Structures are given as structure tokens and as C-alpha cells.
Design a protein around this nucleic acid. Structure first.
Ligand SMILES: [Mg+2]
Ligand SMILES: [Mg+2]
Ligand SMILES: [Mg+2]
Ligand SMILES: [Mg+2]
Ligand SMILES: [Mg+2]
Ligand SMILES: [Mg+2]
Ligand SMILES: [Mg+2]
Ligand SMILES: [Mg+2]
Ligand SMILES: [Mg+2]
Ligand SMILES: [Mg+2]
Ligand SMILES: [Mg+2]
Ligand SMILES: [Mg+2]
Ligand SMILES: [Mg+2]
Ligand SMILES: [Mg+2]
Ligand SMILES: [Mg+2]
Ligand SMILES: [Mg+2]
Ligand SMILES: [Mg+2]
Ligand SMILES: [Mg+2]
Ligand SMILES: [Mg+2]
Ligand SMILES: [Mg+2]
Ligand SMILES: [Mg+2]
Ligand SMILES: [Mg+2]
Ligand SMILES: [Mg+2]
Ligand SMILES: [Mg+2]
Ligand SMILES: [Mg+2]
Ligand SMILES: [Mg+2]
Ligand SMILES: [Mg+2]
Ligand SMILES: [Mg+2]
Ligand SMILES: [Mg+2]
Ligand SMILES: [Mg+2]
Lengths: 152, 117
RNA sequence: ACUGCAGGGGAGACUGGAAUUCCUGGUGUAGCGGUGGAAUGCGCAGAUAUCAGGAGGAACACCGGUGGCGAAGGCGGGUCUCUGGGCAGUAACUGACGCUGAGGAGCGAAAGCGUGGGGAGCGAACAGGAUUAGAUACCCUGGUAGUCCACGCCGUAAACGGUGGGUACUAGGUGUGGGUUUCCUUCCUUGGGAUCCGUGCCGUAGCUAACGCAUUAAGUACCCCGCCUGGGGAGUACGGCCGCAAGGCUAAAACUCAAAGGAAUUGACGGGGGCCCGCACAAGCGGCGGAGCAUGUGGAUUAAUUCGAUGCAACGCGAAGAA
């Protein structure tokens, strides 16, 4: 708003996985107030990923988010008779939020049966750097880099 | 297939383009790479990014043809002057003295009518 | 009259530099130009760019200003020739020879007209592109007369200080320009003081409807000339004078209406300036508009579909219960 910033609400660390990250994904996939259901889906996906790989699910998630972390956005502006996109830098928190939203959205509309295996496959693809979120990040990066001339 | 260790650099920075040509001290052009010569078209040719990349193209062509140092003559009320200068400096070329050679008519030819946009 | 002073006052002749364009040649390759975005356009048959040389017309950066000059319009690249006016000083000379001026005469921005020349750049008309519903415009690409010179014509401008010419008087304060004058005369200061001619601003009285004027009056008086009697019709008609023409000057009436107008105040508005704010913008979350059902509305039908409500702020409203 016009009257300065608004502090962001804090989060708690999950007893099962002591990191704010897992709570962040639960919050992002939470819909209709079913926090327990979101936790169940994320735990099933993480257990599936651990079953398929062997390494720690939080480490796989960290690899995935580091791979899908973007650098610049393409926020647009209009001055006169035309509108053009302006590539600007992104803060780490905003980049993490955008990548998590992209991952969740692409896992929601995948061609599988349940979100356990859907999110397991999505996080594994993001960890290996070949998934839908990675493709979206590459597209955003290149289409923003194509507008480097208008960098005011 | 020439060798001109010393030469001259001319930058013409206007409101619609930016031309960077590199000549020998006698003024014979060796390279002339421009904002339009590099990938650009429309009004983007007058952008500082376009001017600086055209300077990069001109500098690399001069390096290929065998030029190590050039003096710079600039003219025109363009915004790519300093960016082109910096690119020519830190793209493998030395600029030395910087001089402005913008023509100054002593009240000669009548200018066109003012814009009524 | 004599001695000094400043000046883009004016006319003629010669001449200089910058810049644009064009021509020729060299270097050189794929773009150049243009806009808010583009396209028309130019180049690839060698363009833009760079260098050197040449041709040509126009206008004279810096000085340059709030300044100077001129009756007004207007006036600065330089040099020379001819010429106008003004200011200061002495009071040298004449002795009211002064002021205004109906008609009349001359001068008079730009645009335009005639004759010959010239034409770099700009640029009405015109053409293409672009915007838009349309775009006979604003923007872009071009481009003719014209802008320039010589001699004539035209005599019109918001030709304005929106203030006719001349004179006398009516506190001051503060800049600038041209002189002169003693003193402080070295306090070097070219400052201050006195006077004359101007040019700005602020300010006393006075005037004014107010805004404002205020020694450069719109104050206090005199002399002369010009002009007005509500707004349109109309600065138009007819007649007349001038003009190659365009048109200029003198200049009405019928009819129509009861206002047209000048200052200042409040409010409102603005695609005016400054600030701030709102799920208002922005980041996201969940919906409508697509399908079926319920309710209200419009229209149609009928015996009524009793009636009111109609933007946001009416539409599951009045109606928190129609067999
Ligand atoms: Mg003459
Ligand atoms: Mg020519
Ligand atoms: Mg050539
Ligand atoms: Mg050339
Ligand atoms: Mg006598
Ligand atoms: Mg007289
Ligand atoms: Mg008379
Ligand atoms: Mg004329
Ligand atoms: Mg003529
Ligand atoms: Mg002629
Ligand atoms: Mg046309
Ligand atoms: Mg034009
Ligand atoms: Mg033109
Ligand atoms: Mg004609
Ligand atoms: Mg005459
Ligand atoms: Mg005048
Ligand atoms: Mg009078
Ligand atoms: Mg008088
Ligand atoms: Mg008087
Ligand atoms: Mg004075
Ligand atoms: Mg005053
Ligand atoms: Mg009066
Ligand atoms: Mg008449
Ligand atoms: Mg007549
Ligand atoms: Mg008002
Ligand atoms: Mg938003
Ligand atoms: Mg819906
Ligand atoms: Mg619908
Ligand atoms: Mg009803
Ligand atoms: Mg309701």
C-alpha cells in the first residue's frame, strides 16, 4: 500500500521435517482449509520421491528449488503509444514463491491419477532440471532477456 | 588483410540511430558497424544498448582488421555517446583523447518548422 | 553658432568564416532516414558514414543585454565612400521667427502583383504514408509558387504603451546609458556629491468601477487635431476615388433583440502545477458471464398476471412465508 510495507506472517517448523520449506509447500497446496489433507499429499509425494531416489526428500527439494530458481521477471509498463516489457531483478523470497507456485500449478494439471504421485514426479523432474517448472523458468528467462534494451 | 596500428573512430549518435565507424588517421573507413547493422530495427536503434553493442561490433571488426588504438570523434545529441565510449574502451581498444566535433552553424541554413504534435 | 560625445540611423560598393545541400574521387558494405509506433522514401546498379577538392544560394553564432539607435515600420559578419538625426558644454548670434494642424503630401512589418535574374535550406498548394468511424489536419516522406536580388505596384497588421502632439507644476527609493561639473582627489574610487538628456522597477499624494497609473501619469491645467453615442445586420450594400489584379478608402438602410460588454468574488470544471489517500492500481486467492435449478425484472399472452420501485444508491427490493 501507500503507507509503507506490511510485515509477512511467520511460519512454524514441521516436527517431521524441521524446515520452513515443507510448511511453505503445504501452505501453497492448501485449498478449502484442509491443512491436514495438504500435509498428507505432500508427505505421500515426499515418501514416493524418497522411495524412488534414496536421498533425503528435503535435499531433493532443495536441489529442485535451486534448479528452478529464476533470476529476472518481465513486468510490463506502458508509456506512450505502445506497451513493452521491462526486465527487472527478483528478490530471493519472491523468486522462491514464484517457483513454488509454478511447480504446484504444473503438478495440478499433469496426466496422472492422484496428487501424491503427481507431486512426487513434479519434484523429481524439478530436481533433475527437466520438468514443466524448469521449462517455464527457461521461457521466462529468455523472453525477459529478449527485452534487455528497455531496462529503465 | 591490412594493418593499421593507429586510426580514428567516429561515433554519430542521433535520436534515431548510432553509427560507429573506424578509419585510419587519413579517414579511410576500415569498419562501420552500426546499431542497424547489429540485430535491431525501428526505434530501438537509438537505445543505449543498441549503441553499445554496435560499438562492440565495430571494436571486434577493428581488432580483426589489425587496429590497436584509435582516437574518438563524437557528434550528435544522442544518448549512446558515453555507453559507446565505455564499450570501445573495455572491448579491447584504447580511446585516448575524447573530442566533440559536432557541427556548429554560425546562423546559416534555416531549420525546419517546429513540431505541432 | 562653436567645441566635444554615443550609436545594429540609412544607402552604395568590395570582401570573410561556420554550417546545410550538391558534384568528383578515395575508404567501405547492407543498411539509412523517420516516429509514441510505423510506413511511404533512399541504397544495394554501391547508400548512411569518413576523407580531400570544388560549385552554389541564404543567414551572420560568440559579442548579445533588462543595452543602443530611429517619427513609426525597423536596425549588428568585416572594410571603405556618401549622408541623416540626437545629446552635452559656451552663450557666441537673431529676436516670438512658437504649438497644433481640416484637407493634402511623404514614409510605412509580413503576405501578394508586374518585368528580368537567382534558388542552398525552408516551405502554402499538391502527392504518398500514418492516426482515426471519417482525417480534405495535427505526425512522417517529398515537393511548386514564395522566401533572395534589381526597378516598380499594393498601403494593409494585436502597425500595442490597446494610452495623439506641446508646455508648467506635483514626495521619495533603487538599476542602466551619454555627457558635464567642483568637492571628498587619491578616500584609485574611477567610487560618492551636483546638473542635463533618456531608459526599467518599486513606491507619496491624487485619479479610477476595479485592475491599475503614479515625474516616462491614466494627477493637477491650458492650446490644437482625431474619434463614440446599445448589440447584430456591417466596416457590408449602392454611389464615388485609387489599383494590372487582389483589393484599399469614404460609407448606409430596412429588419431583428433587450441585451451585448468591462473589472472583481464565490463555486465548479481541466487530458494545468504541488502533495496525500482508497482491493483503487499492482502480487495472488476464490467467482460470474458457458449448462441445469430457485427468485426478482423487461417484453408477450390472458381474467388479473393488483401495485410501486429503474444506474452505481431498483432487480432473494417493498414481500421476516401468495391454497
Ligand atoms: Mg540595393
Ligand atoms: Mg544543387
Ligand atoms: Mg563515395
Ligand atoms: Mg559523403
Ligand atoms: Mg540683439
Ligand atoms: Mg506639426
Ligand atoms: Mg491632414
Ligand atoms: Mg515581402
Ligand atoms: Mg516577384
Ligand atoms: Mg520570376
Ligand atoms: Mg496524399
Ligand atoms: Mg511537412
Ligand atoms: Mg522538406
Ligand atoms: Mg500567383
Ligand atoms: Mg508607395
Ligand atoms: Mg511593431
Ligand atoms: Mg486626450
Ligand atoms: Mg501629453
Ligand atoms: Mg506630455
Ligand atoms: Mg534614473
Ligand atoms: Mg509601480
Ligand atoms: Mg480610464
Ligand atoms: Mg469596403
Ligand atoms: Mg462599389
Ligand atoms: Mg470561480
Ligand atoms: Mg492487481
Ligand atoms: Mg461462472
Ligand atoms: Mg455463463
Ligand atoms: Mg413488475
Ligand atoms: Mg438480499
Amino acid at each position: 500500500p501507500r503507507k509503507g510495507p506490511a510485515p509477512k506472517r511467520p511460519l512454524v517448523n514441521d516436527p517431521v521435517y524441521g524446515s520452513q520449506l515443507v510448511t511453505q509447500l503445504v501452505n501453497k497446496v492448501l485449498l478449502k482449509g484442509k491443512k491436514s489433507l495438504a500435509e498428507r499429499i505432500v508427505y505421500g509425494a515426499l515418501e514416493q520421491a524418497r522411495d524412488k531416489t534414496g536421498t533425503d526428500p528435503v535435499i531433493t527439494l532443495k536441489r529442485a528449488l535451486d534448479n528452478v530458481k529464476p533470476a529476472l521477471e518481465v513486468r510490463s509498463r506502458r508509456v506512450g503509444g505502445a506497451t513493452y516489457q521491462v526486465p527487472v531483478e527478483v528478490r530471493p523470497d519472491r523468486s522462491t514463491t514464484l517457483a513454488l507456485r509454478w511447480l504446484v500449478g504444473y503438478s495440478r494439471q499433469r496426466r496422472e491419477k492422484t496428487m501424491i504421485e503427481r507431486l512426487a514426479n513434479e519434484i523429481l523432474d524439478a530436481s533433475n532440471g527437466l520438468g514443466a517448472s524448469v521449462k517455464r523458468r527457461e521461457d521466462t528467462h529468455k523472453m525477459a532477456e529478449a527485452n534487455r534494451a528497455f531496462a529503465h | 588483410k591490412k594493418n593499421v596500428p593507429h586510426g580514428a573512430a567516429h561515433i554519430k549518435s542521433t535520436f534515431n540511430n548510432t553509427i560507429v565507424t573506424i578509419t585510419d588517421p587519413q579517414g579511410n573507413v576500415i569498419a562501420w558497424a552500426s546499431s542497424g547493422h547489429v540485430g535491431f530495427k525501428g526505434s530501438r536503434k537509438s537505445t543505449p544498448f543498441a549503441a553499445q553493442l554496435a560499438a562492440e561490433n565495430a571494436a571486434r571488426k577493428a581488432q580483426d582488421h589489425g587496429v590497436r588504438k584509435v582516437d574518438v570523434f563524437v557528434k550528435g545529441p544522442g544518448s549512446g555517446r558515453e555507453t559507446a565510449i565505455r564499450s570501445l574502451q573495455a572491448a579491447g581498444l584504447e580511446v585516448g583523447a575524447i573530442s566533440d566535433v559536432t557541427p556548429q552553424p554560425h546562423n546559416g541554413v534555416r531549420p525546419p518548422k517546429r513540431r505541432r504534435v
